[PDB]
């Protein structure tokens, strides 16, 4: 509940239904990096999991986020996919 | 010239706290380390602070 | 201004002598405004005791050579023409150039425009007329030959152009049915006048002493042909004599480089980068006499008259110089704002246009 | 507000230890016009090493505001370790008065 004019805070990398539906299980890490672009976040702590977070907070109030996360066996084969379409507040 | 302090040899850096490496909890690994490592080679003979005869050698 | 208009030329103080020849104005007339501050080649012309004269504004006037009274006047402009190139006459036609690429031919009787055509760019050169062709050199280095009766181009030749020219005046000359011409690139050339075929061309200056100034090499003088030898003279280049057919250099002189040389009695008379008059032999250019007293009092084309060399300066004096030794003979009255254009070698008469457009008839 | 000013300098002696100055300033915000001429001299009691920075001057000032004011004055200038300093003494020809002034001004 504030009225002061914020700029459009936007965060992460761009996602769309056309983009994310390209990904399917068994892709090698290079091919999915090409399909969505390089992951702007990845799990530092000793695992291959990638986090395609698309988050926007434009205008005065209201925020939107899509969380797509990918996890890979060693040698970089995509084994599981999770896609939260909205911020489950 | 604004640098008058540090060029005095302020030795204020010698107060700086020592490095204190993290340890990984069970089931995790810390990110792989990078090039900003301070090599552990040190010599007791080497003076520090104002005691170091910074003035140039006697016969270069 | 902050620039203070500082002086660096340090022009030579005026040499002077008793007026032995007592030069006087037979008559004087105004043909309009002057060429003024714009460097240009407008000069008067004469045929059969009718004078013709021109104004950079556009005005063209015909004068009686003895009375100086008008016969006819035409404005030759739209309701300025930047008239330039300078008057030439053949038969009943008066030919005139323009800095807006027009060429005009006017009737001598009344001045009505007989034909008018466009050439490739400003026609800074004086039209040169011969056996049915009017040959004109443009600022684009083009030579265009116009049909004398019709003004349509018969043929055209291209001459190369430096990145910065001096002045593309470089009027051609005609000999034995060949036209010999200068050019801003510093190469004298010859072309076969019936059909424009290249015959020969020859470089006559050095280069690479500078990126610009020392490689300014414009042959803006008219060449001259006598007994079959071509003489050519180039701003930083050598005076050179050449065969009409071989294009080989017989000899070179550094003795003078720039302006409007003339030849008589097998002596060449010349003006240099800095305004020294001198006389040279055909038999290898060597100084017969020299008159280095006028430097930077910007002179004009020397005209030989009554056994003298006549040359006007930048401020209004007609310097008379003896033809056979380098000594002054007279100094005419200070005329209107000085001179910047050739006197004409008329028979018996002389005419010169001052920068304000006053024509003067000079006599003794 | 707007202010614009011009200064010209021209030395009288060829070592430039003696030099003369003209200054004009115009300002708008009421409005002001100022014109000044100043003569400059070697200093009384110290060597050229100090003369490199210490200066002494005599000046004429004429000014008008839309008042008319006219003054003539001697002035000292110094570039101190702190910043650049002016001292001035004045005896006006036109009309309490600004008989002495002292002025320090720098950007840090």
């Amino acid at each position: 509940e504030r009225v002061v004019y914020r700029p459009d805070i936007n965060q992460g990398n761009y996602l769309t239904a056309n983009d994310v539906s390209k990904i399917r299980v068994g892709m090698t890490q290079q091919q999915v990096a090409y399909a969505l672009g390089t992951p702007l976040m990845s799990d530092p702590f000793g695992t291959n999991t990638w986090f395609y977070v698309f988050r926007q907070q434009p205008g005065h109030e209201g925020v939107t986020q899509q969380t797509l996360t990918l996890t890979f066996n060693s040698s970089g084969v995509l084994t599981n996919i999770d896609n939260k379409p909205a911020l489950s507040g | 010239s604004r640098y008058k302090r540090q060029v005095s040899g302020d030795e204020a850096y010698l107060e700086a706290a020592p490095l204190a490496e993290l340890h990984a909890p069970a089931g995790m690994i810390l990110p792989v380390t990078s090039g900003d490592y301070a090599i552990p080679v040190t010599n007791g003979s080497g003076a520090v602070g104002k005691a170091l005869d910074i003035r140039p050698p006697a016969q270069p | 201004l902050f620039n203070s208009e500082e002086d660096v030329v340090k022009m030579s103080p005026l040499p002077t002598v008793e007026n032995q020849f007592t030069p006087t104005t037979a008559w004087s007339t105004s043909v309009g405004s002057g060429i003024g501050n714009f460097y240009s080649n407008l000069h008067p012309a004469l045929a059969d005791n009718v004078v013709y004269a021109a104004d950079r504004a556009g005005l063209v006037k015909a004068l009686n050579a003895d009375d100086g009274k008008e016969i006819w006047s035409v404005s030759l402009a739209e309701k300025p023409a930047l008239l330039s190139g300078g008057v030439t006459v053949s038969g009943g036609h008066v030919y005139i150039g323009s800095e807006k690429a027009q060429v005009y031919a006017l009737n001598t009787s009344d001045g009505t425009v007989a034909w008018q055509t466009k050439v490739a760019g400003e026609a800074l050169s004086r039209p040169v007329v011969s056996d049915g062709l009017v040959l004109i050199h443009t600022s684009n280095g083009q030579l265009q030959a116009l049909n004398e009766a019709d003004g349509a181009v018969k043929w055209t030749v291209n001459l190369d152009m430096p990145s910065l020219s001096l002045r593309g005046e470089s009027a051609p000359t005609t000999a034995f049915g060949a036209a010999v011409v200068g050019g801003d690139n510093g190469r004298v050339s010859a072309v076969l006048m019936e059909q424009g075929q290249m015959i020969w061309q020859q470089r006559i200056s050095q280069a690479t002493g500078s990126t610009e100034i020392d490689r300014l090499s414009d042959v803006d003088t008219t060449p001259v042909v006598v007994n079959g030898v071509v003489f050519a003279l180039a701003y930083n280049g050598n005076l050179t004599a050449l065969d009409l057919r071989s294009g080989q250099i017989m000899w070179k002189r550094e003795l003078g480089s720039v302006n409007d040389f003339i030849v008589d009695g097998n002596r060449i008379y010349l003006v240099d980068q800095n305004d020294r008059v001198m006389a040279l032999t055909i038999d290898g250019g060597v100084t017969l006499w020299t008159q280095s007293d006028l430097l930077h009092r910007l002179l004009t084309s020397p005209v030989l008259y009554n056994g003298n060399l006549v040359v006007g300066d930048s401020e209004g004096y007609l310097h008379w110089i003896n033809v056979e030794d380098g000594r002054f003979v007279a100094q005419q009255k200070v005329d209107s704002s000085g001179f910047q254009t050739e006197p004409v070698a008329a028979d018996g008469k002389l005419l010169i246009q001052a920068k304000d457009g006053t024509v003067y008839s000079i006599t003794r | 507000k707007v202010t614009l000013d011009t200064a010209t300098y021209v030395p009288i002696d060829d070592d430039h230890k003696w030099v003369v100055l003209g200054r004009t300033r115009w300002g708008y915000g009421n409005a002001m016009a100022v014109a000044s001429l100043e003569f400059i001299t070697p200093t009384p009691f110290i060597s050229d090493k100090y003369a490199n920075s210490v200066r002494t001057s005599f000046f004429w000032d004429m000014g008008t505001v839309w008042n008319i004011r006219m003054s003539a004055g001697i002035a000292l200038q110094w570039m101190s370790p702190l910043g650049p300093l002016v001292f001035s003494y004045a005896q006006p020809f036109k009309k309490k008065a600004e008989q002495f002034q002292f002025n320090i001004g720098k950007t840090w």
């Binding site: - | 640098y3 040190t42 050698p57 | - | -």
Partner: protein
């Protein structure tokens, strides 16, 4: 400035060195420059250059000390006391970092432009890894230990600003940068709560719990 009589270069050197011993760097600098100008290739040239980089340093002519040091290391890369010149390049870059804030010291300036601290760290580490026998190595090591912390405080200040702005992916990226470049320092251990917060605000609770596990196991 004025210059002394010069025909014996040894005496102008001796007076320059006396002024340098006195601590009158403004005299020693000008007289050593005079000697360098009058006898540039003489035998004294090397020791004169080492005295002149010392006078430029103590005179706080740091960009000239930098230029002279780079020129010296170029001119004699094999000089037997080049370790001292390397050390002086460290000190001069670090002193360029330690500027006054508008003439007043003691403000925490750790989140002003770190590039000169980064260069000083590079050049001290290039010393210690190259010349481990040199007497300057222990002092260079303490310079490195200070400089790394002073760089991690910059990364922490940027992560804190993006925490306030709410750019949670910038916060996570910068704290992961600290955890890989600057693992073994304070400010990193102070930054881990910012990363745990940023993950929690993005509803990436698994990562937030992983970071909370690191905080717990490493909590002081």
């Amino acid at each position: 400035k004025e210059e002394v009589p010069d025909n014996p270069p040894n005496e102008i050197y001796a007076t320059a060195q006396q002024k340098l011993q006195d601590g009158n760097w403004r005299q020693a600098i000008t007289q050593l420059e005079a000697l360098d100008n009058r006898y540039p290739f003489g035998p004294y040239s090397q020791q004169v250059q080492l005295d002149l980089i010392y006078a430029y340093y103590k005179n706080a002519d740091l960009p000239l000390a930098q230029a002279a040091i780079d020129r010296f290391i170029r001119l004699n890369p094999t000089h037997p006391n080049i370790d001292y010149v390397m050390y002086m390049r460290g000190l001069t870059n670090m002193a360029l970092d330690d500027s006054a804030l508008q003439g007043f010291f003691g403000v925490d300036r750790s989140d002003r432009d770190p590039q000169h601290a980064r260069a000083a760290f590079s050049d001290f580490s290039k010393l210690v890894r190259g010349y481990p026998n040199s007497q300057y190595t222990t002092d260079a090591t303490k310079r490195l230990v200070f400089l790394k912390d002073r760089l991690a405080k910059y990364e922490y200040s940027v992560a804190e600003y993006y925490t306030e702005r709410g750019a949670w992916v910038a916060v996570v990226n910068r704290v992961e940068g600290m955890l890989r470049d600057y693992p073994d320092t304070q400010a990193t251990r102070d930054a881990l709560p910012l990363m745990e917060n940023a993950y929690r605000q993005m509803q990436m609770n698994a990562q937030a719990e992983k970071v909370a596990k690191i905080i717990a196991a490493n909590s002081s």
